[PDB]
């Protein structure tokens, strides 16, 4: 059963992007032969989820020149650059590309391409507790007051709105049948796609094979 | 792969029970009648993995909506005692029926001093629920200045998880199993499933059957 181009597309897309070592050792290649691969394969499906009407597409690795030589065609193709993570770990030098490619962005209406880059679901959590258990000590607001849209606020995904905050399908590569703390708190009911294909590999046909997946085919 | 008897066997073990209903339609008896069956399928895995030697084994349920826990635990408890298995019931029990909730409480106390299996009910749980109830209690101790904002740890966090009454070594699962065909969470164990092996059957939870759970238990030994 078949993607349907006309059919449901998944407005948030997550993927677990996986098996860039492996790749490039079953090619007897050194392994960041493989990362230079992954990072082009990257560049092919931003572009194709984008044809395709998704409106997350975020991307998390389980960077150096690649933003600046990639600002370019995401201007081209209209994609707003956001980066989940903690920034404070990535050298100087990445951190200010990262903050060049999302500001020169920042107006980009079409899809947002997520990237969760030294991200942890159990510490995305813990830092969105201490910051409520910060507020409510400074009497912003109750204990009481605090709902699941007050967690879904403090999460790396609270940027973006409520309907897109949360992916409606997650892919994974590289074989694995792991969540393996990503989104935990998002993923309560995405849809979930396993694929054995490594993340070089992983084309816009896959890509759309786990769309067939998800529109139940 | 085969499911190796000598092998290792997850300590923690989780089932999303799927598949009732559609059950029940495939031989148009009501669908009441799969919902019940699930249940004889409840007792069957609870004393095969008890068996097999698994340590905690959590079942996620998905008036009479909700009478089913009265006559199902009050006739289950005395396997529970032969197999020495210790009851538990996740999420809020408060807000179900007055005569589901002593049932479940007796079968707790019934219960309370066994030392095999934990057999770990979600009733009316939700993960998505059960962090918000563990975010009010921890914000409400460190404004009662018990410790500082950033003291709090990830262990905070799970020792506040209706996982928590669990050592520490037991609270995750390492093997969720989904029944029923159906690929997602929906809102189980969220924080204890990080690293979980995930196994997806097409088998209705009422076929659910020891072999059924050998075979997953065949996977996380990576085959």
Same mark, same amino acid.
């Given at each position: 059963?078949?993607?349907?181009?006309?059919?449901?597309?998944? =407005? *948030?897309?997550?993927?677990?992007?996986?098996?860039? +070592?492996?790749?490039?050792?079953?090619?007897?290649?050194?392994?960041?032969?493989? *990362?230079?691969?992954?990072?082009?394969?990257?560049?092919?499906?931003? @572009? *194709?989820?984008? *044809?395709?009407?998704? @409106? $997350?597409?975020? %991307?998390?690795?389980?960077?150096?020149?690649?933003?600046?030589?990639?600002?370019?065609?995401?201007?081209?193709? &209209? $994609? @707003? $650059?956001?980066?989940? +993570? /903690? =920034?404070?770990?990535?050298?100087?030098?990445? =951190?200010?590309?990262?903050?060049?490619?999302?500001? =020169?962005?920042?107006?980009?209406? +079409?899809?947002?391409? &997520?990237?969760? %880059?030294? /991200?942890?679901?159990?510490?995305?959590? %813990?830092?969105?507790?201490?910051?409520?258990?910060?507020?409510?000590?400074?009497?912003?607001?109750?204990?009481?007051?605090?709902?699941?849209?007050?967690?879904?606020?403090?999460?790396?995904?609270?940027?973006?709105?409520?309907?897109?905050?949360?992916?409606? %399908?997650?892919?994974?590569?590289?074989?694995?049948?792991?969540?393996?703390?990503?989104?935990?708190?998002?993923?309560?009911?995405?849809?979930?796609? #396993?694929?054995?294909?490594?993340?070089?590999?992983?084309?816009?046909?896959?890509?759309?094979?786990?769309?067939?997946? #998800?529109?139940?085919?």
């Amino acid at each position: 059963y078949a993607f349907d181009k006309e059919g449901q597309i998944p =407005q *948030h897309i997550a993927i677990i992007m996986d098996g860039n +070592g492996r790749w490039a050792q079953n090619r007897r290649l050194p392994r960041i032969a493989g *990362h230079k691969e992954g990072m082009d394969t990257v560049k092919k499906i931003t @572009k *194709h989820a984008s *044809h395709l009407g998704v @409106k $997350v597409l975020t %991307l998390y690795a389980f960077p150096v020149d690649f933003f600046d030589t990639f600002v370019p065609e995401l201007i081209k193709e &209209n $994609v @707003k $650059v956001n980066v989940m +993570g /903690y =920034q404070e770990f990535l050298p100087s030098h990445t =951190q200010d590309a990262v903050k060049r490619a999302i500001e =020169q962005t920042k107006d980009n209406t +079409g899809m947002v391409l &997520n990237f969760a %880059l030294n /991200y942890g679901a159990r510490a995305e959590l %813990l830092t969105a507790m201490k910051q409520i258990a910060a507020e409510v000590s400074e009497k912003a607001y109750t204990a009481d007051e605090i709902t699941e849209e007050t967690i879904a606020d403090h999460l790396m995904t609270g940027f973006l709105p409520t309907e897109l905050r949360d992916p409606e %399908l997650l892919i994974r590569t590289s074989g694995e049948e792991r969540i393996s703390n990503f989104l935990l708190w998002q993923i309560a009911y995405s849809e979930l796609f #396993f694929t054995k294909a490594l993340w070089p590999d992983f084309s816009g046909d896959t890509l759309e094979t786990a769309i067939a997946s #998800f529109q139940n085919r």
